[PDB]
């Protein structure tokens, strides 16, 4: 019955995947045609296994409905764009918003505010239309927009997550000087454009 | 010259309009098949037309040789095929695609119902889309093919006796165009019956 | 426990899927550079489902195991090479089988003797090496050779397979209409190249 | 000429010998993931040579624009670049693939080991590989470029200077550079203590 409803989630929401991983890879490729850099690295796509979907409702004392979830989860939907330079990351953002069709629903910048443990992401939920067979669906995808620095952090730091207290030290030493090559590369970047 | 630029950027944004497309019709294949579980698609092919292929129709067509013109005159610039297994999964494809707001109907020739001399069979619609570049929006045309599987096996055949050679096979070509149509009607015969 | 070696099974015989698939493409592509004709016109790639590996062991009344499974089932990797002409079949086969590294395991040609209801495709299984990260596996892969023609064919048959013996009569008597189109077909393109 | 169409075959050829080596790489991958729980390989790029590229290369070594001497003295014209996700899993890489009875090796360059003035880091095999084609056997040389994904962005920043401006951003460079091996000998030192 509701899984159902479950199943119906798991299928618009990767469509929803399809038209964004189609906007942004226009971007990157548009402006790589006029400007002869590439800003997205890589991308990674992900639609929310059902019972960490389950597991997130439970934690958040919520019921365990698709329309409940499709309401208050807002990760469902994931898209992770891997950019090649810090200022990559704001680029991939500007030119995705001025999309009279994607609107904007939440924001939170873990670069400038960092995390405890130096994790560095910037997360965006935007809205996007969906034309299914019979209907419209605009639903949210959680953005993590980053670059390959912040990513091999959080891969190693990822894989720990009784473990984390050992290296919780030293990773956040990683992290800094991770930054701290990474602004040099761009600086660099930033002066041959 | 400025011009050949011009024909780049051409090959460029109707590219990016063939991604948006292809993206839009495998989403209503995959709803439609979640929905009534059949897959209206079998495959789908793509293609932008050759600059030296774009230049020859321009000249066959007594039109000028730039992007500008180019892009107001000819339609088929960025090209999808749309291969269906049956054939009411054509115009099934048809009305999904149109009733969505952003894409507009441009061009129809229907030579399902009104086939050619040779036997060609296939729906043709040009149809506008919007493509978000980084600092501009275009809205460009895409022409569909729209065909069944049988009428994609006929034509690929068609297709490689040109390129006075064509008088030859035109009465056994005709053949097989027409059974090819009746097969496929008993096989959607059978198909609406068991769904 | 068994599990464990049934998911081993998926991973190598997936593996062997790879193989092939690239062998076969380069076929493909390398014959159209000569010739200017493309004999595939598409693949599908399957393997076995576990709950079907296991009921296929039941009904030859085998242990369940993966070692037992490795050795009676040939068609736990399976593809599917659907031709443009009848002819592309034949022409397919021989390519694959000429290669050193190819070996020829089982053979049943349902063109030449269709079965009852009508079905046809060549039937070959083959042996092929998979290295893997610290051992080489030589394993089988079930090859559906077949036309479009068959292939729809096949498509609206088993899906049906009490409801078979109603259109029992008129598929074959599809059956029969596909193969004398596509023959037709042949002769003309036979006379083209 | 009859050249030209030599190159034509020598791209196709070359093209072909990229698929089973990205073949062989992706399933050496995979199977180290399956055994024990990590990922070896980041990504991989694949290219043939441009041929203006080829003929570039044979003229500034004195060569004969002919593809049979392309097929002998160029080793690069095909080109695969395995990014990886530490630094030992660059001679993982080049172990399990060499073991393989078919991968014969060819040509050796380890810039890990020795890295160049400007700070480059990369291990740069030659192999070569069996290709079956419709009616002959083929063994062709692919170039493999083996790298973490900081040499990787490394290599990136480099290549954008060139194209007397290399001068001024080398010392910065050589600093990038020594940093990104620093920072990847720790994630490295810190993803072994916990396999
Ligand atoms: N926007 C995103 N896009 C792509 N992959 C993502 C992603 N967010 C997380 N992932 C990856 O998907 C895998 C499974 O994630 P889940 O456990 O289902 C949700 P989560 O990562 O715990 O986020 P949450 O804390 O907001 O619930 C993780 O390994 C993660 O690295
Ligand atoms: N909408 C479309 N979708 C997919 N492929 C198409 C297509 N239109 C043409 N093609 C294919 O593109 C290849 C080269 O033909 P082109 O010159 O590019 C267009 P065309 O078919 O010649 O239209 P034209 O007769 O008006 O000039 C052919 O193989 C053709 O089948
Ligand atoms: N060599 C093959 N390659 C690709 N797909 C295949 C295939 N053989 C069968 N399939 C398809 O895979 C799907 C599941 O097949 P399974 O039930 O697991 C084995 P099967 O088709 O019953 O063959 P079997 O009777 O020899 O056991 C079917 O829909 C079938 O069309
Ligand atoms: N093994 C390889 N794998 C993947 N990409 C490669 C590669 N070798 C070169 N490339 C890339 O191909 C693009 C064009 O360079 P090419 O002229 O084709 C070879 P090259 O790097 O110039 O070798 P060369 O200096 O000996 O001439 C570059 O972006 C390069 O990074
Ligand atoms: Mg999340
Ligand atoms: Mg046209
Ligand atoms: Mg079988
Ligand atoms: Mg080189």
């Known amino acids: 019955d509701t899984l159902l409803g479950f199943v119906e989630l798991d299928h618009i929401?990767?469509?929803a995947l399809k038209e964004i991983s189609t906007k942004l890879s226009i971007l990157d490729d548009n402006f790589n045609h006029i400007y002869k850099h590439n800003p997205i690295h890589h991308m990674?796509?992900?639609?929310?296994?059902?019972?960490?979907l389950i597991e997130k409702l439970n934690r958040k004392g919520l019921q365990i409905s698709a329309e409940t979830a499709k309401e208050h989860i807002l990760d469902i939907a994931g898209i992770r764009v891997v950019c090649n330079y810090l200022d990559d990351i704001y680029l991939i953002?500007?030119?995705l918003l001025k999309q009279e069709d994607v609107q904007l629903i939440k924001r939170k910048?873990?670069?400038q505010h960092p995390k405890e443990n130096g994790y560095?992401?910037?997360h965006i939920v935007v809205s996007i239309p969906v034309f299914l067979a019979e209907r419209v669906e605009v639903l949210?995808?959680?953005?993590?927009?980053?670059?390959?620095?912040?990513?091999?952090?959080?891969?190693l730091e990822h894989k720990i997550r009784a473990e984390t207290?050992?290296?919780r030290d030293l990773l956040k030493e990683c992290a800094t000087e991770i930054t701290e090559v990474e602004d040099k590369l761009q600086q660099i970047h930033s002066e041959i454009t």
């Open 13 to 15: 929401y990767s469509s």
């Open 44 to 52: 990674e796509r992900r639609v929310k296994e059902m019972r960490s």
């Open 93 to 95: 953002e500007e030119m």
């Open 109 to 111: 910048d873990y670069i």
């Open 120 to 122: 560095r992401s910037l």
């Open 140 to 155: 949210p995808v959680e953005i993590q927009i980053r670059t390959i620095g912040m990513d091999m952090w959080a891969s």
């Open 165 to 167: 207290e050992k290296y």
